[PDB]
Amino acid sequence: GDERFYAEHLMPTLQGLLDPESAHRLAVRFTSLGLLPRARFQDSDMLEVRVLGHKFRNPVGIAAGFDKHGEAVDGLYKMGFGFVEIGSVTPKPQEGNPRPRVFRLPEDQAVINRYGFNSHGLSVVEHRLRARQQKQAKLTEDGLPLGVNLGKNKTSVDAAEDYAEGVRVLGPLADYLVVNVSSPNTAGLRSLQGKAELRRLLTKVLQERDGLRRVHRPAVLVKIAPDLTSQDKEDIASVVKELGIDGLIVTNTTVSRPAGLQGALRSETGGLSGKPLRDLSTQTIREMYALTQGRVPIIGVGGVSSGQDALEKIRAGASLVQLYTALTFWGPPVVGKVKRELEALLKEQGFGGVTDAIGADHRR
Ligand SMILES: Cc1cc2nc3c(=O)[nH]c(=O)nc-3n(C[C@H](O)[C@H](O)[C@H](O)COP(=O)(O)O)c2cc1C
Ligand SMILES: O=C(Nc1cc(Cl)cc(Cl)c1)Nc1ccccc1C(=O)O
Ligand SMILES: CCCCCCCCCCC[N+](C)(C)[O-]
Ligand SMILES: O=C1C[C@@H](C(=O)O)NC(=O)N1
Fold it and tell me: Post-translation: what modifications?
């Protein structure tokens, strides 16, 4: 699990041999078989966070979209992530967009994808999680929670009902649910982010959640785009506080193309992730934290590949962070790297632990 060997040799060679979707599929397969490094980094108490009704032994999770179908959850904990989010899962199976649909921008340390919610569907994922449900219960009790990100089918005629089905089927199996209302790659999905129908949508979601038995009742979070107007964000903050949404995930990929991208493939359609997204997502965290008065837990995601990247989102108001794209460039060692650097920076800047640092920028 040597960071330099993966970063300088293994990964560059893998990317030379495999297109990104092939690499992704191979990585999921290897991970689910435990064929990858087991974290030697043992988490210190400084990294522990309590939010969303759970203990997280460290604040660094794997973002949705890597393990879309729930196949590699245990290998991902083994890799050192403090929590795992699977999905997005749609109600029925669907294939997603035609290939190629994932693109590498090496010069920018970025990826563009237009997968389009390729999904095994709720039923398959349900049985997959049921097969390890008790193992997960112990992991969660141990401080390693599981999130499930819910999507909707391309041809769906009623978006709210798709999400409602997801709550009923996978909600009993998840520590938290994510209503993904921010994918760049499904027609019309992102406009579920406007006020009146976001309120209608989330009201129905929360009602379905509340109808689940107490011990099987997940937290519900909303995952938003980096691409929202001031008005959108203002409206989302309002609805979230009004309905009692448990948290926000900030952010999904961007449909923007920031000035300065060098990759040959920069003009491919889809969502951009990685380094070019980093500060855009950090600023969105900062804004949503202020609009919710620091009362609504935020998971910060976008361009995290170092302890500094993570701490900047934490200080901006994130209680937890996720990464994905950094894994595709640096490989598994990046997880321990981020955790180790985060702990060092926390001591360095005088924080007793992660919890003390949450939102710290707003208190200056
Ligand atoms: C290949 C790929 C597939 C993704 N699939 C999903 C998805 O299915 N559901 C979702 O909510 N986010 C998905 N995302 C977005 C990530 O969860 C994350 O929000 C985004 O990539 C920003 O974090 P990062 O810069 O560390 O990659 C995907 C991202 C990538 C790169
Ligand atoms: O996931 C990996 N690679 C990978 C390689 C290793 Cl050696 C380990 C792990 Cl977990 C993942 N790669 C990707 C995942 C999603 C989208 C694009 C890629 C890519 O390669 O461009
Ligand atoms: C029966 C429905 C089948 C849907 C399959 C969708 C593509 C799944 C490809 C493997 C997972 N992955 C995200 C790594 O491409
Ligand atoms: O939420 C999502 C969906 C994913 C996909 O296209 O499957 N692409 C993304 O970048 N974010």
Answer: The uncleaved transit peptide is required for mitochondrial targeting and proper membrane integration.
Q: Which atom of ligand 3 is nearest to the CA of 93?
A: 2
Atom of ligand 4 nearest to the CA of 270: 10
Report the residue among 9, 19, 24 best suited for mutation to probe ligand 2: largest number of ligand atoms under 8 A from its CB: 24
Alpha carbon distance 281, 321 (integer Å): 11
Which tokens in the block code for residue 238? Answer: 């309002």
Nearest CA to ligand 3 atom 14: 25
**Chain centre distance of CA 161:** 23
Query: Going by DSSP bridges, is the β-strand pair 219-224/146-150 parallel, antiparallel, or unpaired?
Result: unpaired
As a whole number of angstroms, the longest Cα–Cα distance in the chain is: 53
**Alpha carbon distance 210, 188 (integer Å):** 27
Tokens encoding 260 = 């300065």
Four-residue CA torsion sign, 56, 59, 61, 63? positive
60 assigned to a ligand binding site: no
- Kindly report the protein residue whose alpha carbon is nearest to atom 7 of ligand 1: 65
Q: Where are the alpha helices (DSSP H) in 66-147?
A: 73-78, 122-130, 133-141
**Structure-determination approach:** X-ray
Closest protein CA for atom 13 of ligand 3:
68
CATH no., domain 1-364: 3.20.20.70
Distance 211 CA to ligand 4 centre (A): 29
DSSP letter assigned to residue 339? H
The closest of 42, 23, 26, 58 to 353, measured between CA atoms, is: 58
142: DSSP letter: T
Contact 247, 219 (CB under 8 A): yes
Both structure tokens of 231: 């008005």
Give the list of residues 6+ apart from residue 155 with CB closer than 8 angstroms, or none: none
